[PDB]
UniProtKB/Swiss-Prot annotation:
This protein's encoding gene: fadL
Protein's name according to its UniProt entry: Long-chain fatty acid transport protein
Source species: Escherichia coli (strain K12)
Subunit structure: Has been isolated from outer membrane preparation as a homodimer.
PANTHER family from the UniProt entry: LONG-CHAIN FATTY ACID TRANSPORT PROTEIN, OUTER MEMBRANE PROTEIN NMB0088-RELATED
Keyword field: Cell outer membrane, Lipid transport, Membrane, Signal, Transmembrane, Transmembrane beta strand, Transport
Amino acid sequence: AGFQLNEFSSSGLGRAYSGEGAIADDAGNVSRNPALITMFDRPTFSAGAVYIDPDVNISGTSPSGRSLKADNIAPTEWVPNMHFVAPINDQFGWGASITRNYGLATEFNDTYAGGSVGGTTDLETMNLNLSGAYRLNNAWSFGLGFNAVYARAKIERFAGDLGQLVAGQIMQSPAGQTQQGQALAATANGIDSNTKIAHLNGNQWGFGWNAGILYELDKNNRYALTYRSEVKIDFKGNYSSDLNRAFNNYGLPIPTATGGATQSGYLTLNLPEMWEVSGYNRVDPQWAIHYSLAYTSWSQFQQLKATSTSGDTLFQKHEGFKDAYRIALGTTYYYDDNWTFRTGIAFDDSPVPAQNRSISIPDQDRFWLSAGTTYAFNKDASVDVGVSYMHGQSVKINEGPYQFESEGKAWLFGTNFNYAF
Ligand SMILES: CCCCCCCCCCCC[N+](C)(C)[O-]
């Protein structure tokens, strides 16, 4: 789902995040729907983390004859999560949490033949949420939240085999027999594959709000609607390219060369708004069913465009994403006072139109299968453990002068410790 993340808690991870927003067995869920606060009778704490181990691979052959094979370009991630919920009174409550709604990590060896569109891509996001909720009656509750998002990002691209390709072309041309052409070819050949073609890094804060509506027929059946506003991060960081400035202003498809000099850069990153409808049904003292449909407006992510203090475009990449949906269904089986078991299935559509696919964001439609279990220590303290398997469809990628093919899957493991005072 682009670079969107749903791992806000270990439980739920075991649910395949189905019906989040309509379930409140532990404090984690307030982060997804502030209205659920009215479901807590006392200060409740939750904290843990999810290890995401992706297995994304790239295959292909370049016009240079070199392999575009790149195994495991998606590094494993560690997504912590922490929550606290507290009643103000039988009418209002509040909560605070630290989670990750967005993130991405793609890494190619700097000598990768397709380095110009490979290299390194890292996006780290942290969401600090503060919420409040109001219960109107036995059925309706309302929640509103404020969010402060800290983001650390870094982008690096390399020459790859472009120098070789350029040299080849010059040499196959009438210019190949000329002094100017030869000097040109020498230079092109001289551009090593690990030559840093572009560098972009920065950290910045963004702000957004969210809200939720909870409606419960009774104490065992509820539905929810939530909205997470878009969050715009206005980066002000550093840009550079180790290429010689003599490369500039010819119209070449290459980021602005700065002779290695660092230049101040601006880039706005749009973090997509999200909508979600949820349902939780406890059809028995030991069985509950949960499901949801989420809609993330990825069309809000149109491009990555870095700009200089003069307003010149130093680096630009069209993304052209489209809105996407996510569907999830799961059930929880409360065996006894100590044990609770859960499973889930989910499907999230990729927001990237085929012609806009890039190897930097190896996304694709995903199917999730998961299982988890929770051990209750004493009606006040518990531990959650969940696992999920992600399987994605292999797709073709045409980027620049290259044709790639990618496949990706993933294993997720998480644990969270819960405590209610
Ligand atoms: C000061 C500029 C800082 C730029 C770092 C921006 C990172 C944006 C992360 C989104 C994913 C990047 N990608 C793959 C689309 O290029």
